[PDB]
Amino acid sequence: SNVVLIGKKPVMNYVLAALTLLNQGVSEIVIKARGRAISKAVDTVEIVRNRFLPDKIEIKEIRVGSQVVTSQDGRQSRVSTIEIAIRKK
Template identity: 60%
Template sequence: MENDDVVFVGNKPVMNYVLAVVTQYNGGADTVTIKVRGRAISRAVDVAEVARNRFLTDMEVKNIILSLPKK
């Protein structure tokens, strides 16, 4: 499936999304994409940092892409 290695961040607690990232990574995913819209951008940054610093110390952030939808 296309969205297997994507975690969509919304309004749930940060640790829910961290668990999803760690689960994807431990399940054999080479990359995990964190997608977010609007006000949850800071929550997505928190998810990436908590996952990287606390659980997946060998993980690296490859790139950050910010874009706006086309009108």
């Protein structure tokens, strides 16, 4: 895969999922998140490139967007999204 979707789980979960990938051959991953989890998506990247692989990781690209979603009622609503692709420097 190589995609880490930020969910409702505590940050450490994702920085671990993230490190596991990298420190395992994978040279590039993509942190994806939407809604309020967007905050956590950046937190995940900073923690990764900061207290775990400082100087060995670079942000290759960052995309922000909106995605229409269908709620339980069947009603449409949109949420913001972020995509942070990073790779071993």
